[PDB]
Amino acid sequence: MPEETQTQDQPMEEEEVETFAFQAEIAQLMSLIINTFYSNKEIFLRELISNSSDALDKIRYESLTDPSKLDSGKELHINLIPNKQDRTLTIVDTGIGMTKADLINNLGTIAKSGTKAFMEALQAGADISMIGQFGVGFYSAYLVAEKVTVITKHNDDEQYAWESSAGGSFTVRTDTGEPMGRGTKVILHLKEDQTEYLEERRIKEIVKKHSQFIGYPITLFVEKERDKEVSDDEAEE
């Protein structure tokens, strides 16, 4: 064998990771949306739930091609759990699945010079409340969220932690923490300085009414109730 290796592991000291930034046209979109200000528009709650269901809708069709994940049913469902300690609304599911090629192929910021056509329509026709529906701007969430982090766990593939928030600069780096096998963890970072957004009661009914009794299992986390379980919460200061 070679002469050991030790517990040392460092790819690059300088810069360390791979980052990119489209500071031009995409930065114009970003500046046009930030000047809209955080006026709170929960319309996105409907837009994103449609997108989430859309990804399960695709794998639903793919289940006819490959029924391997339909063999048992270990996952493949809508899990919506808010981590009060992490201030992140965690949406975890398997979805139809994505590969590393989909990421670099620009899963986001898919405007790329075609932004002018949409800009024209946005100038005289439609407003920003439709950009997510076209799948070219899921950054509509920035109106009520500040950071979006996507970590992918590996299984017969590689794993990466990709993120973005604003500006138009994103980063890709490999992960080294295994809390799951192979899953897409969508953690939405709440800007605590604006909204708690951790009202389990509203979130419970809001998804219930919007589901309209859909034929799929949903796992929603809640906050501590009172009976057998007990934990303190700081509401009064």
DSSP labels, the chain? --S--TT---S-SSS-SEEEE--SHHHHHHHHHHTT-----TTHHHHHHHHHHHHHHHHHHHTTT--GGGSS-SS-SEEEEEETTTTEEEEEE--S---HHHHHTTSS-TTTTTHHHHHHHHHTT--GGGTTTTTS-GGGGGGT-SEEEEEE--SSS--EEEEE-STTEEEEEE----SSSS-EEEEEEP-TTT-----HHHHHHHHHHHHTS-SS-EEE-----SSS---------
Under a CB-based contact definition with an 8 Å cutoff, are residues 36 and 141 in contact? Answer: no
Q: Establish if 2 belongs to a structural domain.
A: no
Q: Establish if 116 belongs to a structural domain.
A: yes
The verdict on whether residue 138 carries a ligand-binding annotation is yes
Q: Establish if 92 belongs to a structural domain.
A: yes
**The tokens 């009172």 sit on which residue?**
226
Listed residue (102, 91, 110, 88) closest to 51, CA to CA: 91
Under a CB-based contact definition with an 8 Å cutoff, are residues 184 and 152 in contact? Answer: yes
The verdict on whether residue 51 carries a ligand-binding annotation is yes
Count how many residues are written for the chain.
Answer: 237
Domain encompassing residue 162: 18-220
Q: Establish if 31 belongs to a structural domain.
A: yes
Q: Establish if 56 belongs to a structural domain.
A: yes
Q: Establish if 225 belongs to a structural domain.
A: no
**Whole-Å CA distances, 179 to 41, 103, 110, 174:** 33, 22, 31, 15
Q: Which pair of tokens denotes residue 40?
A: 């709170």
Please give the Cα distance from 128 to 43 (Å, whole number): 11
Q: Establish if 148 belongs to a structural domain.
A: yes
Rounded (5°) CA angle 209-212-216: 115
Please state the domain count of the chain. 1
CATH number at residue 95: 3.30.565.10
Experiment type: NMR
Q: Establish if 4 belongs to a structural domain.
A: no
The verdict on whether residue 35 carries a ligand-binding annotation is no
The verdict on whether residue 155 carries a ligand-binding annotation is no
Task: Please give the distance of CA 117 from its chain centroid, rounded to a whole number.
Answer: 27
Task: Please give the distance of CA 8 from its chain centroid, rounded to a whole number.
Answer: 32
Name residue 141's amino acid: A
